[PDB]
Amino acid sequence: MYTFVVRDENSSVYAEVSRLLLATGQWKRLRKDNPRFNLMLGERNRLPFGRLGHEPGLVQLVNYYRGADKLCRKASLVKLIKTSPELSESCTWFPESYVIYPTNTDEREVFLAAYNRRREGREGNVWIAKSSAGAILISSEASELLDFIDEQGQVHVIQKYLEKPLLLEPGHRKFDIRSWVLVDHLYNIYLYREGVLRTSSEPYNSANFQDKTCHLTNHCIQKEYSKNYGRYEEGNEMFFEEFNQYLMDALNTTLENSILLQIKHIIRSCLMCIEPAISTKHLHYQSFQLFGFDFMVDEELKVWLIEVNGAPACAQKLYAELCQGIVDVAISSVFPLASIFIKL
Amino acid sequence: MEVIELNKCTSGQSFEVILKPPSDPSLEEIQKKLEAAEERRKYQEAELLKHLAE
Amino acid sequence: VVXXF
Amino acid sequence: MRECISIHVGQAGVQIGNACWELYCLEHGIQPDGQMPSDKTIGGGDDSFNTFFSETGAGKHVPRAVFVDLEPTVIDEVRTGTYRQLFHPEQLITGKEDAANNYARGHYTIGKEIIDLVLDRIRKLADQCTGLQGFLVFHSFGGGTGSGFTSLLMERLSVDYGKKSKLEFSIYPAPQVSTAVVEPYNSILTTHTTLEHSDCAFMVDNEAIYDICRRNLDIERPTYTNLNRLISQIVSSITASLRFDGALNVDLTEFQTNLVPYPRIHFPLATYAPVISAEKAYHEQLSVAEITNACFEPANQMVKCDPRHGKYMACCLLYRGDVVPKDVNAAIATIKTKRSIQFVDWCPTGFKVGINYQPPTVVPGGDLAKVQRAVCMLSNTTAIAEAWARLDHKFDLMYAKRAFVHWYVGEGMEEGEFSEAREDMAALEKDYEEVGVDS
Amino acid sequence: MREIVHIQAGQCGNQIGAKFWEVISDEHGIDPTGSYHGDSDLQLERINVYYNEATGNKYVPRAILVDLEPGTMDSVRSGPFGQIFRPDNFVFGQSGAGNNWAKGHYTEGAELVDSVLDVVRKESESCDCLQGFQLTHSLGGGTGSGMGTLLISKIREEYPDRIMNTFSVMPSPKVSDTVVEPYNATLSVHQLVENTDETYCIDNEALYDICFRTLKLTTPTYGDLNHLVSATMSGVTTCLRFPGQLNADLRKLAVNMVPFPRLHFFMPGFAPLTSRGSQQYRALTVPELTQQMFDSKNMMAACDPRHGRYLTVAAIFRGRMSMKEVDEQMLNVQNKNSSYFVEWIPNNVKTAVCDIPPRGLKMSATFIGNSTAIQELFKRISEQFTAMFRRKAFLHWYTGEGMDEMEFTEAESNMNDLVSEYQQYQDA
Ligand SMILES: Nc1nc2c(ncn2[C@@H]2O[C@H](COP(=O)(O)OP(=O)(O)OP(=O)(O)O)[C@@H](O)[C@H]2O)c(=O)[nH]1
Ligand SMILES: Nc1ncnc2c1ncn2[C@@H]1O[C@H](COP(=O)(O)OP(=O)(O)CP(=O)(O)O)[C@@H](O)[C@H]1O
Numbered sequence A: 001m002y003t004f005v006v007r008d009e010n011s012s013v014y015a016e017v018s019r020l021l022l023a024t025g026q027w028k029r030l031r032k033d034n035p036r037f038n039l040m041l042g043e044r045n046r047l048p049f050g051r052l053g054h055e056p057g058l059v060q061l062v063n064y065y066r067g068a069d070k071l072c073r074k075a076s077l078v079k080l081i082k083t084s085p086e087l088s089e090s091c092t093w094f095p096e097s098y099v100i101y102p103t104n105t106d107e108r109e110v111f112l113a114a115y116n117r118r119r120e121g122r123e124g125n126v127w128i129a130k131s132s133a134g135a136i137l138i139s140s141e142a143s144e145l146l147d148f149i150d151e152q153g154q155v156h157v158i159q160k161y162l163e164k165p166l167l168l169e170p171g172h173r174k175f176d177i178r179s180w181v182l183v184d185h186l187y188n189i190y191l192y193r194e195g196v197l198r199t200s201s202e203p204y205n206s207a208n209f210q211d212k213t214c215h216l217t218n219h220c221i222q223k224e225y226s227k228n229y230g231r232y233e234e235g236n237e238m239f240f241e242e243f244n245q246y247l248m249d250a251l252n253t254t255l256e257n258s259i260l261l262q263i264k265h266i267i268r269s270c271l272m273c274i275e276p277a278i279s280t281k282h283l284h285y286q287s288f289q290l291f292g293f294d295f296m297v298d299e300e301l302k303v304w305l306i307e308v309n310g311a312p313a314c315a316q317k318l319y320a321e322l323c324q325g326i327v328d329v330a331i332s333s334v335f336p337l338a339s340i341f342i343k344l
Numbered sequence B: 001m002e003v004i005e006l007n008k009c010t011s012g013q014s015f016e017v018i019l020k021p022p023s024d025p026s027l028e029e030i031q032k033k034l035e036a037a038e039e040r041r042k043y044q045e046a047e048l049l050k051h052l053a054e
Numbered sequence C: 001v002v003x004x005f
Numbered sequence D: 001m002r003e004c005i006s007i008h009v010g011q012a013g014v015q016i017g018n019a020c021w022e023l024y025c026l027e028h029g030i031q032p033d034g035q036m037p038s039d040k041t042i043g044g045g046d047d048s049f050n051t052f053f054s055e056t057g058a059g060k061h062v063p064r065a066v067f068v069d070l071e072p073t074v075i076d077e078v079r080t081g082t083y084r085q086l087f088h089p090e091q092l093i094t095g096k097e098d099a100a101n102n103y104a105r106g107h108y109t110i111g112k113e114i115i116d117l118v119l120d121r122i123r124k125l126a127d128q129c130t131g132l133q134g135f136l137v138f139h140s141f142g143g144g145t146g147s148g149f150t151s152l153l154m155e156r157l158s159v160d161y162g163k164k165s166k167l168e169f170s171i172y173p174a175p176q177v178s179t180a181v182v183e184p185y186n187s188i189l190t191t192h193t194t195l196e197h198s199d200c201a202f203m204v205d206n207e208a209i210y211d212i213c214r215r216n217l218d219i220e221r222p223t224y225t226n227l228n229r230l231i232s233q234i235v236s237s238i239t240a241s242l243r244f245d246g247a248l249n250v251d252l253t254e255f256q257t258n259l260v261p262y263p264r265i266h267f268p269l270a271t272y273a274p275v276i277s278a279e280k281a282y283h284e285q286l287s288v289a290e291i292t293n294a295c296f297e298p299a300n301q302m303v304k305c306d307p308r309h310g311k312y313m314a315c316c317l318l319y320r321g322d323v324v325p326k327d328v329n330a331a332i333a334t335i336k337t338k339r340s341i342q343f344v345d346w347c348p349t350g351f352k353v354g355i356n357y358q359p360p361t362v363v364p365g366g367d368l369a370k371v372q373r374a375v376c377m378l379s380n381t382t383a384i385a386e387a388w389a390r391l392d393h394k395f396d397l398m399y400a401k402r403a404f405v406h407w408y409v410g411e412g413m414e415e416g417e418f419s420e421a422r423e424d425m426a427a428l429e430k431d432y433e434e435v436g437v438d439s
Numbered sequence E: 001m002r003e004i005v006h007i008q009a010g011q012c013g014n015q016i017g018a019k020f021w022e023v024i025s026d027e028h029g030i031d032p033t034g035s036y037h038g039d040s041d042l043q044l045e046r047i048n049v050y051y052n053e054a055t056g057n058k059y060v061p062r063a064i065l066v067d068l069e070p071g072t073m074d075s076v077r078s079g080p081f082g083q084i085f086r087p088d089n090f091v092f093g094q095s096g097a098g099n100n101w102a103k104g105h106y107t108e109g110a111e112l113v114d115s116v117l118d119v120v121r122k123e124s125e126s127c128d129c130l131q132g133f134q135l136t137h138s139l140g141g142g143t144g145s146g147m148g149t150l151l152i153s154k155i156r157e158e159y160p161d162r163i164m165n166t167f168s169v170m171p172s173p174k175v176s177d178t179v180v181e182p183y184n185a186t187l188s189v190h191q192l193v194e195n196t197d198e199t200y201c202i203d204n205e206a207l208y209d210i211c212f213r214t215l216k217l218t219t220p221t222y223g224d225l226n227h228l229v230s231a232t233m234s235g236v237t238t239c240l241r242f243p244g245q246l247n248a249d250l251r252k253l254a255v256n257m258v259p260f261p262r263l264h265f266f267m268p269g270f271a272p273l274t275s276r277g278s279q280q281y282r283a284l285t286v287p288e289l290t291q292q293m294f295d296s297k298n299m300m301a302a303c304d305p306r307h308g309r310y311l312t313v314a315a316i317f318r319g320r321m322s323m324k325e326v327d328e329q330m331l332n333v334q335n336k337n338s339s340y341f342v343e344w345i346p347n348n349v350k351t352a353v354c355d356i357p358p359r360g361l362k363m364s365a366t367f368i369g370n371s372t373a374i375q376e377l378f379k380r381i382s383e384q385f386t387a388m389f390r391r392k393a394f395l396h397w398y399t400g401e402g403m404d405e406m407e408f409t410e411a412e413s414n415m416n417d418l419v420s421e422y423q424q425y426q427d428a
């Protein structure tokens, strides 16, 4: 028999994993504050790693890597990609970025040197604002949003907008790929075979920039700010099998070669970089964690890394298969009872 | 990387190694507490022996 | 009930 | 030459004390008689071992030490100990009614009734000291005596010897061997009271040394004797500099200097390697760069915590035995890469190193193999704060219901002193936080 | 904290007191005349805890035998170890208490109590360092119940800083047909809440059920009931009688077991369960000692521990065995049945292991639990009580000795408070 707890109920995913755990007749659930547990589906934030692995005769596992926020928070990821040699500042797959603290270690603004390097520029340049909160603006002239940054108290970061994204037809539409990554206590990097395209509903035009929702492909902005949805793909979620067939009948390639290699590469690069910082190989407790990587592909079929989601939600379709998959690999490899993944 | 202050001997040696620079209560006062507890305790024992006298 | 050591 | 007096308090204090002075005497070649064939400064000396021993005309070398236990059982074993001739009667102080794992009983009740006998017996040793540099206090966090009488003694020494130095060796409690449910009470209570009277304190989680004793010496149910001979090997590595001739950590003042920037944050994490089973006839000889790396593997730490997610303020490497600086600085160059070592932005990101050519001795017939080289790392990392968090969660659980509190009140202590000592600790976790994490 | 003074009051008290001394004497290698004839030296290390020494290095129990009729004590003196006891420490009257608490506590007992305290004092001065007192008695009769609680109230007065421990036999209709026992018991409980630090709740309902169901004895005798008590008492005091680390004196035990001054009523368990006829050729496995000692069938208190929550637990293992395996099985129960332990007392289960096993077994386990389920016992008595008191039945035996209805109402009231307090912390 096994014992587990839960301290994040607002999590879509582990609500389902908790559901599936109780369906095995071998996992009893304890009160969120019982110390004598085997597994911990801890809280997104403030997770007390200091108390794990100090219960005699209890093997303890958790669904977060302490130190993993260094890769998932925006300003941290940037600082990580330039400060970490394994990923040179000269990074082929990560857009140019600089960390930005308001007027209230400011990288503010060796950034500006880059803009005037494009005053000599006929290469158009446009940079984003995007933030800790789900509430973001985009324009060529820098000064405009630097005010928008100095306005609010949060720390921000600026990065070049990909002005020539791959455009799905019919629709002339923008999109981005979300891939789900699982790292176990051994630090095996597993990739879920199923991915999703967060497609944009309308055509992509570089004309208008203010709240134009043909720029952003979030589930929240496409449902709320558009009379356009399900025309081509129900849910604006184009799963891989379709995107695969399109790219062949369109550009004569595959998802595997044009995009998936580059994706699988950036994954290995990021996790192996952070690996000695967070690995639980020789710790008194063990860790595992699900990640969600957001990628952007361009018209030359080059893949870029946007951000790393430390607390990712799944596509409704893939819940039953993935949440099942998590238990196979992350929990039951540590806690045995009585493939849909890809090792890297 | 910089070695500094190499102090040697027959029984051992030592040095520093840098990789990057930066970037009360009284004697009586105690006893005043030691007796404030002897009293607080003697009191609670009076109240018991008082409860027992009843 | 009848119960001797 | 500056003398050090070590004060052994309670059951834990006295039993570790034996592991130490047993090991000391094997390292300085002193016999169970207190006789020393190596020494020629008969009657007295200005040698460096004299900082821990005084001398007698008959040629005996007598530990500059005081033993105290409110219970006579433990100290009685010293008296008939294999090493009994060493200590003289005045050094071994014993009561009859112990403190029953009650901090209040040790501090207030039983404590008042012996404090002026011990100080008198410490004074008799201070009056055999030409330039006393200070005190080394050995005790448990959990015990009644260890927590209660210790905090009493420390307060007095800060008065009777205000300018002298006080260093702590403290045993942090682990359920796996602990013998009381209220050890978390006595832990917070004694830390709050003792904090301003301790210059530097070395914490040892019984949990850590237990698992080290299981993992590295293949022992199924480690006894205290197992736990103690390990500890002594650590403690020796800390003190060797005072006892032998060195240039690093040469007097107690240097410890505060090297390891303690913030006076309140004076709990250096000790890591030690190699811990080798003696039942392993042949053991692979771990090189310098190998054992230097082990200093950053949590499994070898005296407290299980993760320095990676803390910052450093200081870091010392104390090598004993066959080590030369070339092999050292080499391995130091290595680890800065592979390992997550962030220092504070107001400290140099470096290491203080020391070598002691005499190698780690081991007790004949013990569970530790003699090794040619060994290291002991003393890192003042904020990751040790994790141990205060552990200890404090356990405290709040029990005190929300005032569980067992009545035992303390009944000794004359106030229920408010609990609140006083916990809110002190809640600041220490904040101080550790302000120093070592990104805002 | 070295010497303990033992006292036994009344029929039950003296019978189990006697059996208790029979048992531990055999464990410490002391013969009926008081000479030592045992192998191991663990047997004599803390012998000074319960025995005194004399000329010829004979060992005399530190025991005071009390009764209001000569009956049981004459029988004990011509009992097996009869001549072992200090002759002067026999203190008896002739009138009897007639199963009346009032006679025991206020009249017939008051007439005798001073003389007993004289022998207590004489023993307590022989003490280099006294811990306190353990009393053995029933709560259902008159002498042990009434005179017993009086002696405690009086002894707490001379030795308020000492620890007061009791082995108290709770009454059951399954064993006694005396109607007034619920009166005697309720009155006694009020005393015990106030004036003891530790009380082992030995329930005759449990002991009878154990004897009849598990041991398949169709006509259980007192000797059968007491064989169970004897075993429990040996086990529970083992951590006191031999060298050990945990709960090694009465004060420390109290501090580990008692989170609140009033809730000091312990639920003893024991394994393997044995009758004097049972063979017990097959020693149990460590996992078997554990699953049983937590099993309600092995509880001496007749409560269902699954109805409440453990505040604290001591667990004592005896005999040569894998101390490694003891910890795993102990840590297993805690982790398996974690809901039944209160969360707000971390690591409330503590364990000791003594090498010397009990007479006739190779492997034994003794349980000491401060469960909130103990209330069920007090609830039982409370009902048997009110059934009569609401009609003021049989009160004339008590009022006739000087008591008043009000004194009953308050003892009724104070025990109902006890139950509610045990229920306050069961939902925490
Ligand atoms: N490493 C080690 N830990 C010990 C030793 N003795 C006790 N402990 C630990 O210390 C705590 C108990 O405190 P003690 O030192 O035994 O008690 P005390 O200081 O003698 O005080 P009282 O016994 O109440 O009079 C528990 O957490 C034990 O696990 C020892 O010899 N070595
Ligand atoms: N350099 C760039 N090029 C193209 N698109 C970019 C971009 N930088 C940001 N975006 C846009 O940002 C949008 C949303 O990404 P975001 O950073 O909000 O991640 P997310 O919504 O999946 C998790 P959260 O918002 O909670 O942090 C994407 O649709 C993407 O088009």
Ligand SMILES: Nc1nc2c(ncn2[C@@H]2O[C@H](COP(=O)(O)OP(=O)(O)O)[C@@H](O)[C@H]2O)c(=O)[nH]1
Binding pocket: C003, C005, E009, E010, E011, E012, E013, E015, E016, E097, E098, E099, E100, E138, E139, E140, E141, E142, E143, E144, E145, E169, E170, E171, E172, E175, E176, E181, E204, E222, E225, E226
């Ligand atoms: N277990 C046990 N219970 C007893 C024994 N003798 C009496 N009792 C119980 O104690 C109660 C009677 O108390 P008793 O000791 O005989 O009265 P006293 O002599 O006035 O103290 C009843 O509940 C009996 O069942 C005995 O030898 N063993």
Ligand SMILES: [Ca+2]
Binding pocket: D039, D040, D041, D042, D043, D044, D045, D047, D055
């Ligand atoms: Ca000399």
Ligand SMILES: [Mg+2]
Binding pocket: D010, D011, D069, D071, D098, D143, D145
């Ligand atoms: Mg002690």
Ligand SMILES: [Mg+2]
Binding pocket: E011
């Ligand atoms: Mg009778």
Ligand SMILES: [Mg+2]
Binding pocket: E095, E111
């Ligand atoms: Mg008369």
